[PDB]
């Protein structure tokens, strides 16, 4: 028509105008008119007590929303249907919920999984949670042997258990509850792609709660009581095990790890940086001097001097540097390859030292925690190529005796030299992993290492573009141009005669055509077919546009967004890996670096219950202090939020209005 | 503008030490693989800079020049041949040179672009107040007497 | 110089105490102040009328 | 020592504890204890009335800060030294300043340039400004024939004049006041390096005020009364003249300009885009048909057809496209050259049309507004190369008669062909300036054009790096090499024989070595000097690192920050240039594109009628605007603490009055 | 808390602060950071300082070079040094009249206060 008719499609019963006067009496703060209207309401005919608006509000709630406790005492003095009014008393953090605890299909606003203590934990109010635990309320355990209720109810249970007040109260130790809950919520967010950000939010909440308990640690003996609690530094090991990147790199914790890392050094971190370079240089030069000791006399000044973990790092990395200067020296110095040089004879204790060090590293931690870090996998590939290299040198020495250059092209000396060179690339890229100790080159290296996983998602797409244009240029050019009468037959050849002939040759031609290293005369046919040459050069041109312009600048943009997202969490991430580095040098069994790891390098009971009860009650005493001052601290921080909702004005408004209705009731 | 670039230089110089260790890495590899495989001293010109590029991976210093100039498009593929017939060492050497070009030109250099995107975003907030500090360091070196009558 | 700094510290302290007022954010404890400024007045007037 | 002592270094007098009881009688709202203590204060024994805290807090101010008007009436009933208390009544927007207006070296908190109406304009409260204009208060004019007071006082005067309530009140028309003040504050921010962001902030305030008056225009006849007010569309021409990029691209004004741009197309902007391409294609094909008319009969359907400005754009740009397809056709077709082909005989009316069009464009607007836009300068260079081309063709035809290739190397046919080709590059890059009409290719082109000025600041640094490494590589390679036997002698040759020989050759070698186009055998010496070859290749290497690894990625980062700063304002600043494109086709005298370009008391009655009509419309807009901003002052989603300081005394004074009536 | 009135109420009774330098470990660095956090407030420097520009400059220098010493608590001492560097600019902002500004920027205990400001890297005092 010309107009639209607006009618209430979903009908509401509404209420008798006398009932509207009763709900006008309440919420205005009338202690007189509500009492008069309820005494009238005893007579059944005039009005009903449990009257409900078309918009919620069944009488009792209005006395909670407009926070007035005398009307709650008046309505609970009568028989008002409570229903879910206790839960509405929990949301607003009204501590008049005592009056709903101590005393006394209908459109419940809440999902029916909600018990009072679940919604008490969601509001994170310490007082109401203490008021509900004192009566005794349980939570269901989450594990299982129609579908929205199950995942919603499990997320409400984990959302309730992850609150820092059912972990401050009702936990034997809140650090294990925060750590194990952060683990179960993280690994639970990986299970369900749906509800991913909510379980990640809860795991971030548990990871922040533990740092906010560390922040309350004064008097550093308490910090050692926390970080030594074995049910060494067992708590830190268990914190690094659960990836608690904010528990570690608390500034209190790094004081403990930094002093532990600097045993006898005095004000080492106060000296000049060039003096630090001189001390690290001359300690790095004397690494066989300190490590011949601890084999002669481990109870000695030099034997106790390498037991200090900052000196273990300079001895371990200094030994590794001399291994690398010796590999620099290897290339500056017969098919029957024997001891080719004195260099290799010097190399074998270092290589057996790294193989022993990686097997010894795999004897503790397991292949899961070993295979989690990428540098250990790089050590596996490196040392595997060292075993292949020395095995092909031995096998090359036996059963071979002498053409100069002519050889089998799979002669094991050549494969030994090639795998040796690849193992030198992988061996001398380990110095990058030495950057996490430095404070300037540290966070940079870990930000790049964090962008690598976003690059490797991108190169898949590029590999499918390579398979695409490789199929296309091979298919078009394996008939038209083929040369078998040529001398050098590859892209490498100075002439570049065949590029797209075969598929592997085409993959090399496109991969090298990322760079400016393959010329156009590549795409010419020895015959005279200008159509297939033009189609092939257009094929190669759109490859260069999609790869060089379309995708590589998308990779730049992707690393711009990823590096923006990384550098926020760079400092707290760097220090977690710096502790991982530091805390691998605290333990004994791990001193005496690689050439001295196995041999000197060749010239070529009621007291258990007493300590458990001692340490247990001591730790629970410290926890009692930390949970006390923590709950006081967060309650303090609840007050300061710099924002006032509209229901605070709703509280002041009735504070004035009920006082008006009472003074005017006493004056008239 | 000049002071924002001067501000980004200290973040570049932290970056080039990583690249120097990558140069040390692939230089150790390509020297170690190509010092025996090929040599040939019967050349009129004998380096990368020559018109034919005869020996590039032969010496460590020659390999450092070959990788550094292979950042740019200035070193051709026929560099990685062997005068003898060893297709395996030529392929492993060209794969090592290829992963050098991927790590240096595709991953390392665009990470440097991203790093200068974040650093230049962090600098240009405090650009106006830090330009004028250096402008008064320039101005206030001309207020005193004893420094007039130029060079 | 101490007279000039007397003037600057005077008008500076006045300026920052002026800027403490205009923060565009009220914490909840301000409502905790107004609520007791009504509540004590309630329990005093009701103490004088009863 | 072991401690550090803390003493009050800047000591002041401490008020007598009775005076502390008097200043504790105020700040609580006592209407009884203040009155008793002041009646006691008439006796000079116990308390002086004008008592001052060590922290401001004069007795009167506390009654203003804690906003209580009855204590202001009580203190002004007595003789309290007011001083600067009126100004403190202005800051808090207390409308009890009436009581300080109608009635009645000391540490003034304010700079002594501050009159009441300047600080009334800084607070932007309409009511207090109306209360001070009704008494009659003037502002000093800013112009001049010890130094902080002068620039601070001028910035307070311009800060007061730029407020949208001394422009809503006290201005004959607030659009000229907003436009001219935005101009004077922008061009005043360019004068003073210091205080740049503050005058730019005030000019942005004036530029927002005008758009916020156009937002109050309902009933589109009012919008035409505003946008036609000549003291055509004179107010939009004057708005584009003052770079009011937010006045233009209000959504109300772009409907007037869009409907003006579409005269007799009923709902053109609703059709399918391919149908739009067909209509623009066949109107673009019939350009000579519509433009032979308006020469035959300008009072005719086809003569009035080309007077519509959307059809002028398709005829002008379609004619320009056929000029460019004809330049494509020129290269697909004797020292003493003629007008050699039929092509250039066809070209000459096109070229004389553009020269006439640019001289005709320079007859109106002046060389300042003409030289402000860059495409007009590009037209100047293009048509200058056209004059040089045809002049060297005519000069080449006379006094020359025939070696086919062996020529002078400066022979005017070659210079004519080279300048003709450069003029074709410049001529066929004008199609990019056709992008502002399109809604998808529009804001992109203007964002790139706004990054160009940030690129050109960067290339001067790069030119100094070129002079640096060019001085080095020339200085090192001038001696060691100079192959003067080679058949081909430069970088462009097949062998690249001498590249760092001379300075110009070195500049070409480094510039082309930005790209991968110069090999390494360039840096050899014909002699055997490995040290100078290595130092030269290290200099060339550090040139490649500074230019390609540091300098060019810094340019990428710079364009990342600049493009982030541009794309916030990209859409509004696109539409300003789109109305600069649109509004150049509204006027007559400018039709008939390039090849067809050449070949009395009633005045006072209309001035009073338009003047009183426009003042009535502005009466309505200022009324509903002031109502709109006073509505928006209420909703700010933030309460300062002094609101709680108002409610707390509104309870406290009521307490000390009820307790005064019951006891 | 940076409240001027309560600080004036406590200085009038006479209260001292320990000096930070010395010849179990959380109390020492936490107590040191509370002492420097208290001395860096712009009301102990408005009161209880002979001249607050030298106190702001020298405290910004000791808090910056103290943040370089301790890698832990780095952002907190940098925050306090930024607070001291903002305080000096917020005292310049209160300079009305050219003559006063020259009294400040000529105070040798030339332009000695500008030279001493550039010496302490006060990039917001300058500009
Ligand atoms: C598809 C999944 C991957 C992501 C999607 C990619 C988006 C689609 C890519 C578009 C296809 C590439 C264009 C066609 C290639 C081509 O023409 O290459 C084919 C040939 C190139 O020369 P040949 O003909 O000799 O091969 O084109 C020509 O004949 C010459 C004229 C064409 C000019 C090309 C204009 C396109 C602009 C591309 C360069 C942009 C540079 C950016 C810097 C300003
Ligand atoms: C390690 C510390 C530094 C940072 C970490 C770097 C991350 C790991 C880098 C991955 C290794 C590089 C890939 C291997 C190189 C290689 O294959 O090079 C080795 C050869 C290249 O040709 P040759 O065999 O002739 O040498 O590979 C081939 O045989 C041809 C088929 C392989 C195709 C490569 C596909 C990988 C994609 C890389 C290009 C991406 C371009 C991006 C634009 C879209
Ligand atoms: C100065 C104002 C401009 C801005 C300031 C620029 C910052 C300073 C620039 C540093 C100087 C450049 C380095 C020296 C050039 C050079 O060595 O070039 C000189 C030569 C290059 O080969 P030649 O010796 O044959 O010339 O160096 C060598 O001999 C080979 C070994 C050096 C390896 C260079 C390692 C530096 C890393 C630079 C590449 C980074 C690539 C980034 C992608 C990962
Ligand atoms: C080929 C060999 C002979 C040398 C190749 C490596 C060296 C040239 C450089 C490259 C990386 C540098 C390393 C990078 C990082 C560190 C960590 C850094 O250790 C610290 O920061 C000390 C701990 C602290 O700072 O508290 C100083 C030494 C070291 C190993 C550097 C030692 C010198 C290295 C190995
Ligand atoms: C793709 C390469 C080969 C360039 C093609 C040459 C021309 C045919 C193209 C280049 C730019 C195009 C122009 C770019 C922008 C416009 C504006 C546009 O005009 C409008 O938007 C109509 C007004 C409106 O949309 O309200 C449509 C035509 C036109 C001139 C285009 C016409 C066709 C042009 C001249
Ligand atoms: Na390992
Ligand atoms: Na023009």
Curated annotation (Swiss-Prot), chain D:
Disulfide bonds join 488-493. One of its GO terms (cellular component) is protein-containing complex. Residues 272-306 dip into the membrane without crossing it. Residues 331-344, 395-414, 474-538 are extracellular. Residues 1-271, 307-309, 360-373, 438-450 are cytoplasmic. Zn(2+) binds at residue 143. ANK repeats lie at residues 15-46, 57-79, 82-104, 112-136. It is a multi-pass membrane protein. It catalyses: Ca(2+)(in) = Ca(2+)(out); Na(+)(in) = Na(+)(out); Li(+)(in) = Li(+)(out); Cs(+)(in) = Cs(+)(out). Abundantly expressed in brain (hippocampal CA1 pyramidal neurons, dentate gyrus granule cells, and cerebral cortical neurons, and in the septal nuclei and the mitral layer of olfactory bulb). Lower levels are detected in other tissues. GO terms for molecular function: beta-catenin binding; cadherin binding; inositol 1,4,5 trisphosphate binding; store-operated calcium channel activity. Residues 181-218 form a coiled coil. Keywords: ANK repeat, Calcium, Calcium channel, Calcium transport, Cell membrane, Coiled coil, Disulfide bond, Ion channel, Ion transport, Membrane, Metal-binding, Phosphoprotein, Repeat, Transmembrane, Transmembrane helix, Transport, Zinc. The keyword Flavoprotein does not apply. GO terms for biological process: calcium ion import; gamma-aminobutyric acid secretion; oligodendrocyte differentiation. Ca(2+) binds at residues 358, 361, 376, 379. May be operated by a phosphatidylinositol second messenger system activated by receptor tyrosine kinases or G-protein coupled receptors. May be activated by intracellular calcium store depletion. Residues 73-143, 212-251 are annotated as: Multimerization domain. The chain crosses the membrane at residues 310-330, 345-359, 374-394, 415-437, 451-473, 539-559. It is found in: Cell membrane. Belongs to the transient receptor (TC 1.A.4) family. STrpC subfamily. TRPC4 sub-subfamily. Homotetramer. Heterotetramer with TRPC1 and/or TRPC5. Forms a heteromeric ion channel with TRPC1, with a 1:3 TRPC1:TRPC4 stoichiometry. Interacts with TRPC4AP. Isoform alpha but not isoform beta interacts with ITPR1, ITPR2 and ITPR3. Interacts with NHERF1. Interacts with MX1 and RNF24. Interacts (via CIRB domain) with SESTD1 (via the spectrin 1 repeat) and SPTBN5 (via C-terminus). Interacts with CDH5 and CTNNB1. Interacts (via protein 4.1-binding domain) with EPB41L2. Interacts with PLSCR1. Forms a receptor-activated non-selective calcium permeant cation channel. Acts as a cell-cell contact-dependent endothelial calcium entry channel. Forms a homomeric ion channel or a heteromeric ion channel with TRPC1; the heteromeric ion channel has reduced calcium permeability compared to the homomeric channel. Also permeable to monovalent ions including sodium, lithium and cesium ions. This is Short transient receptor potential channel 4. It comes from Mus musculus. The gene is Trpc4.
